[PDB]
């Protein structure tokens, strides 16, 4: 229905309460639009997203249980209806070259933030793990 | 200097005479802005560029003698002054994924168009090689 309901209905489902909102983090870093890495941190800190993307428990390491769903939401957020996991993976490759995110070799769909997110976010990985009830 | 000088000076150097100008090719394919594969076909058919990129003589195979210069011009053409071969190399990977350009095994900076450029361009490799005095 209306936007008032959209907010209320989603608030009932415990949506829209991430610890690290992509939009807020973009204002902090001054990037304007949200970037992919900020979008991932938002899902990783949103309890309502732990079914398709979650922390593993080892530092800044995370896995995409449903890679297609992550590409689907990224497409919804950037108005890219033709977004799929092939294109999202292609983008993550540029994050590799920049030493922002690394692939965990030996696991499928598992990566790790290798930039100093602690000094950036002011959170340690374990702190967020407890806030999110990571197993 | 002025624009009339910029065009005359480049003319005296036998520049601006590529057999396959990226812009002309883009209009032919209706792609709008030039794409990387078109930009490469421009350098590869521009005699003033044979120092850093050229054909090898074996069909649609070519080598980047100065990979940095190729990434530098692609940067100037798309207003990406921070362009380098690492980013350009990911770009070529996209054409690998799409079976448009493959890597020559065991050789660095050596690629081959594996699409059907002869049907698209109306040229054979040997025809262009003769026009370009390829050794």
């Amino acid at each position: 229905g209306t936007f008032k309901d959209y907010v209320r209905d989603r608030a009932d489902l415990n949506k829209d309460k991430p610890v690290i909102p992509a939009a807020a983090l973009a204002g902090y870093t001054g990037s304007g639009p949200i970037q992919l890495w900020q979008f991932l941190l938002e899902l990783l800190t949103d309890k309502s997203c732990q079914s398709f993307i979650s922390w593993t428990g080892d530092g800044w390491e995370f896995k995409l249980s449903d890679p297609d769903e992550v590409a689907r939401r990224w497409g919804k957020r950037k108005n890219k209806p033709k977004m799929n996991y092939e294109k999202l993976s292609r983008g993550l490759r540029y994050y590799y070259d920049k030493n922002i995110i690394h692939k965990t070799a030996g696991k499928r769909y598992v990566y790790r933030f290798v930039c100093d997110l602690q000094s950036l976010l002011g959170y340690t990985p374990e702190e967020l793990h407890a806030m999110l009830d990571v197993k | 200097g002025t624009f009339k000088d910029y065009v005359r000076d480049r003319a005296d150097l036998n520049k601006d005479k590529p057999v396959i100008p990226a812009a002309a090719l883009a209009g032919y394919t209706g792609s709008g802005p030039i794409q990387l594969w078109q930009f490469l076909l421009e350098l590869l058919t521009d005699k003033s560029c044979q120092s850093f990129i050229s054909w090898t003589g074996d069909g649609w195979e070519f080598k980047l003698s100065d990979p940095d210069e190729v990434a530098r011009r692609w940067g100037k053409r798309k207003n990406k002054p921070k362009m380098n071969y690492e980013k350009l190399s990911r770009g070529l990977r996209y054409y690998y994924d799409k079976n448009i350009i493959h890597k020559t095994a065991g050789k660095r900076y050596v690629y081959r168009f594996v699409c059907d450029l002869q049907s698209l361009l109306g040229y054979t490799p040997e025809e262009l090689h003769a026009m370009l005095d390829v050794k």
């Binding site: 870093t29 992919l36 292609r90 983008g91 540029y94 930039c115 100093d116 | 770009g91 996209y94």
Partner: peptide, 16 residues
């Protein structure tokens, strides 16, 4: 650390 643009032909950044 810095976060340069992630904008390419095979992976274009959105804006508007």
């Amino acid at each position: 650390p810095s976060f340069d643009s992630f904008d390419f032909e095979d992976f274009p950044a959105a804006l508007w």
